[PDB]
Enzyme design. Structure first.
Site, mmCIF file in Angstrom:
data_model
loop_
_atom_site.group_PDB
_atom_site.id
_atom_site.type_symbol
_atom_site.label_atom_id
_atom_site.label_comp_id
_atom_site.label_asym_id
_atom_site.label_seq_id
_atom_site.Cartn_x
_atom_site.Cartn_y
_atom_site.Cartn_z
ATOM 1 C CD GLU B 255 -2.125 1.755 2.615
ATOM 2 O OE1 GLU B 255 -1.530 2.832 2.810
ATOM 3 O OE2 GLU B 255 -2.816 1.181 3.483
ATOM 4 C CB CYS B 294 -2.809 6.138 3.934
ATOM 5 S SG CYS B 294 -3.874 4.955 4.804
#
Lengths: 678, 678, 60
Positions: B255, B294
């Protein structure tokens, strides 16, 4: 004779460095292949600009119908493919498994797509997920087609099956395909591509073919593209570290060489049928396709006591196999695809022999003959736990090694020592042995078959990968997965959690969800045709009061006199504290409330999807039913005379007098359509 | 003050090159971190030899119970974690979302595991797949725990949630975890690890922690290990091309940084509530965690006409946010974690400004202050389609850029121009706009929320990743997936298609499958307790003859007078050709046949799993029921006084007088247990 | 037995009822002709039913 590649909507060939396709039997070069100077970026751009939107505009049902039509068209012209497959050194049986496996894969994916994919461009995979106490905020998962291109790099093993096994889910996922087949057998793949292009059943740019080097195609790919690879470990490992692929986080799937094992159970003895079918299975897998299938058996693990028996029973059976030109009568095994392949197989055999192995049946081949023939080879490893090369080196030919095991756990250790495999077989009759073997060795094998007397009657075989089962494995096998039914489709799609109000999610999914806005039309929904129905078309039914008489009558009629319904004393001591109404009577009474009796568009019920009883229903409670259209799925007419029907799912919500839901479930129905589609 | 790392069952620290953890507010160095000279191979070996077998010996129910117990233990000691999280420059709200999100994730995975995972060490995921005409050969998919180790490399954003979100499915999948947290906030992660190790609720070696460099751990991994990464794109791309990882085909999930968008619909106007909640959402996502999550919004896409309005409404709302030490009253936003982070954010802002961007609210920070404070920054891009840097550069801080759109399609193009994102928001009230936006932009976003008046009441927010929904995205987002409920578990398992006889598959799955061997005991299965029941325990019931009276009586009692049952004329013209028995009456009559009336171990029915009516049942047909125990699932007692119960699934097969199956379905039941477990 | 009946229900006559007070529900008498046929469309029952039907608009 140039082999043309189909890209940018045109058949074209390259100029410069060319590789030769030789006849496997004759040895004569009959094709040369090159793609130098062809514009790969233009091919990608062409596939993306018009192929991908044309595929994405189609619903899953339409794409499944396209797959079915393409399958029928390819089946009509199978004789051409048989003739061209004869050039690869495969027998009629091998050509049968390749071509018919490919066409069967297309048929199976079409059937699966028709049965259990939505009549939409989006795929809601799961039920609604509640995320709030009031039910004003929920989420569900959608799958949407990627806007890029799928690049399939195939091996020479299955020129036609290897293409269609990836093409069917790629197209069913709404993604254009660029196919780079292995050079050695590219001439076969091209032919099928030609047929598809000449069928006019597919949109323009939905399929491209590259014969020869891929050039710099992988440098022009973006985040929405995918790459699948089949072949040598080295080439796939080189492709995995491609700077452009790693930069854009492009999905990359690899299937590599695997050391497929076949373990013989300690329970079996030479007197049992299991012994015979084990020998037959091992020999069939060794000899089919001259052992050039990626699922062929390479390691044979047998109990120590049985070794000398097995080593005999195989050799005799392996002696009867006749290696030669398949055209002449009496050949049951063809040749390899290339002289280079033969040299490689010989080199691998020599490596195994140098690393402490003994020849049981001949491992030396004639490296000067025109044909790429290799004799059936059986090797022996006296020290399987002390020789690592037997658990790392595989010969891509009719070569397998048999090794001894002890105490049924050493066998499991040897099976796991492969470092990951595509297929494995255990031959046994004892369920506990099968359980132990799976529980300890399924983590290192992508497919395991337990072969016994009962299974062997209609077993498709150890080596044949079926389209409803996964084709893949960890580690040395590459770490990919393919052909897992609809699983494969989901590799060409993006999974997105969509959050919001139920009404918005219902609009997004074009499927009604719990808590969403409904439409009440004052026309009963069962009186509407399929075309007039919309997801959200709903009816609130009259109420029915549950009585003690209802409990007694339903218990009498059904015969279910369970204590929770028909015994006051026992029901007093139950969790409910008094006798309650039968769940199935709640279901039956609901059906009575919402079903319109008259002859109408509704044809059949046939189904009930997911029933849970949340709250008990007591005598003196009054039930009401909300019936809502949840999902519509058109069915393509198989003929011209068939009644045009569609599958409609209905959510049924049964409440009590406090508006608390007591039953939640879905029913399936067939609803007649006004307009057919031949 | 050395920060100890827990590996090989011991707390130990390294010697040599050390990195400093500073207080985010104070600026004082209060930890130093190093792992040089620690034996990573020994850590891996320790985790594999005893942690992995101990986890694998446990059933899914036991592992879910371990997760629940660990969640409760961590919740009891949350104040320590709050105090240590205060050192990272996070407010009470930010520490709340981190710690309670982590503990909530553990609770949710425990609940999911308890509800819908088997009481076994193996996981049969799907129903049996028939592969033969006689039913002697079938296959089904199993998931088995990998024997290796899961290596989790986490970012500084969520030191505690980022650990537990991966740890919960890793443990539920039966795999030991080695965690390498980001250095900047490692001191928090360690504390939770300590608690777990000190809880004694987990097996020894089931958890390891590495504080500092990973050394050469990735060089010692094998095919059965997995790697997950969260952080910068460059570091993850470097790790993806690790020679050992690519050689052994080790699963690698990344990620990376994403440009999360927030699109304003063209239907909304400043007078609507949608406008206000859009402004509130954007500001909340910008300001929470100082925009270090994020999933924080980086790009704001608004209609051209609305721009000048939005640019005002944000700034005013963004002006009221007070940046300072969270300890003092009146601060609603803390600081960044590091001075290095502040310098990086400033550099990214300067890059954006150099690439044609205008400051709407201050982008210059004090790069000499002790605290790592960055003021809320809002930028403006006049030419979004001509500036590529706005669609590639992201500032990991309280920085977002607003840009104009036109005609609602330019907005979609701008949203897709991100090159792949973790989260996206559309604020609208029109269902068609939501549909178009999802259909065109879900392929580039892993999560999309449609925010309206109805959703905003209980929406968990754009930036909070929930454990029932996927956390991931394609392309720039990394191409990973996490937290997709049970989906995540399947990333730590190997999927294996097992083929063979139904009897062998039933033994392998410890679940009865269609066509498998049954045991008839002459004791009715409903009279047996949970412990005495085995999968395959079966009863063949007496027969019942269906009569015209039965049709009439059931139609009368239920109220369902559908023409297929109660009208001769219409039924003559139906597909069946004569009036048939109600499907639900077949179900009800079956229930009457197999249910034992007496008070017994069976507590409740509560369920029916998958019902299909295959063949019509006519008057004068005689039905018989085979009832077989399919699956057993023990339920852990939540207290000491609760009745120990288990979930038993039963396959019901209803045949006619020709032994042709007319109904196939499964029922759920609660069966009382003899022995509890407190 | 084995005959199949179908019913045609038709509004035959409407008769408004004057409200005796202001709070009374405004109702009217509706007579319905019921024709019950067998599968040969031969009438097996002919009769009329009376009903009270609520009115939207009253008249005090």
């Amino acid at each position: 004779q140039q082999l043309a590649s189909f890209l940018s909507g045109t058949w074209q060939s390259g100029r410069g460095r060319s590789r030769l396709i030789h006849h496997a039997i004759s040895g004569e070069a009959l094709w040369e292949v090159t793609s130098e100077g062809l514009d790969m970026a233009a091919a990608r751009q062409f596939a993306i600009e018009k192929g991908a939107p044309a595929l994405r505009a189609m619903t899953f049902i339409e794409r499944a119908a396209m797959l079915k039509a393409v399958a029928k068209h390819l089946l009509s012209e199978k004789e051409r493919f048989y003739a061209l497959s004869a050039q690869t050194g495969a027998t009629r049986a091998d050509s049968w498994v390749d071509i018919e496996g490919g066409i069967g894969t297309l048929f199976t994916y079409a059937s699966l797509g028709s049965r259990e994919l939505p009549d939409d461009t989006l795929w809601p995979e799961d039920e609604l997920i509640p995320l709030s106490k009031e039910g004003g905020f929920a989420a569900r998962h959608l799958l949407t087609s990627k806007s890029g291109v799928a690049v399939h790099i195939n091996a020479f093993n299955f020129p036609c099956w290897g293409m269609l096994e990836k093409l069917a889910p790629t197209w069913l996922g709404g993604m254009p395909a660029i196919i780079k087949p292995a050079t050695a057998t590219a001439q076969l793949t091209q032919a099928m591509v030609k047929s598809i292009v000449d069928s006019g059943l597919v949109p323009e740019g939905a399929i491209s073919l590259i014969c020869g080097s891929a050039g710099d195609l992988l440098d022009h790919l973006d985040s929405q593209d995918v790459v699948t690879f089949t072949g040598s470990a080295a080439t796939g490992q080189m492709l995995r570290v491609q700077p452009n692929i790693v930069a854009k986080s492009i999905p990359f799937t690899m299937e590599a060489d695997s050391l497929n094992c076949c373990v013989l159970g300690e329970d079996v003895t030479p007197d049992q049928p299991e012994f015979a079918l084990f020998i037959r299975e091992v020999v069939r897998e060794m000899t089919t396709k001259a052992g050039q299938k990626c699922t062929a058996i390479r390691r044979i693990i047998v109990p120590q006591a049985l070794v000398n028996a097995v080593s005999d029973a195989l050799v005799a059976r392996l002696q009867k196999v006749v290696v030669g030109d398949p055209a002449q009568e009496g050949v049951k095994m063809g040749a390899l695809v290339n002289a280079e392949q033969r040299a490689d197989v010989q080199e691998k055999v020599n490596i195994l022999l140098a690393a402490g192995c003994e020849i049981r049946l001949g491992g030396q081949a004639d490296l000067s003959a025109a044909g790429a023939f290799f004799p059936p080879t059986l090797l022996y490893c006296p020290q399987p736990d002390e020789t690592p090369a037997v658990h790392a080196t595989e010969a891509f030919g009719p070569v397998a090694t048999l090794m001894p095991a002890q105490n049924q756990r050493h066998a499991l250790q040897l099976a796991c020592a492969g470092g990951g495999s595509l297929a494995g077989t255990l031959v046994t009759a004892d369920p506990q042995i099968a359980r132990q073997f799976i529980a300890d060795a399924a983590r290192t094998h992508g497919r395991i078959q337990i072969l016994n007397e009962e299974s062997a009657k209609e077993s498709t075989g150890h080596g044949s990968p079926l389209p409803q089962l996964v084709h893949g494995g960890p580690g040395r096998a590459g770490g990919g997965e393919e052909l897992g039914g609809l699983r494969a489709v989901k590799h060409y799609m993006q999974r997105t959690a969509v959050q919001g109000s139920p009404t918005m999610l219902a609009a997004i999914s074009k499927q009604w969800v719990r808590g969403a806005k409904v439409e009440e039309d004052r026309i009963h929904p069962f009186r509407k045709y399929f075309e007039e129905l919309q997801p959200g078309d709903s009816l609130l039914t009259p109420r029915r009061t549950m009585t003690e008489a209802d409990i007694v009558n339903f218990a009498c009629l059904s015969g279910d006199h369970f204590y929770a319904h028909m015994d006051k004393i026992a029901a007093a001591e139950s969790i409910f504290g008094e006798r309650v109404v039968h769940g199935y009577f709640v279901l039956s009474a609901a059906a009575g409330l919402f079903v319109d009796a008259g002859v109408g568009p509704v044809i059949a019920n046939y189904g009930l999807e997911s029933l849970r009883f949340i709250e008990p229903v007591k005598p003196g409670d009054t039930i009401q039913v909300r019936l809502t259209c949840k999902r519509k799925t058109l069915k393509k007419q198989r003929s011209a005379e068939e009644k045009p029907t569609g599958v409609v799912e209905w959510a049924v919500e049964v409440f009590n007098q406090h508006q608390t839901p007591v039953a939640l479930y879905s029913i399936l129905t067939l609803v007649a359509r006004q307009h057919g589609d031949f």
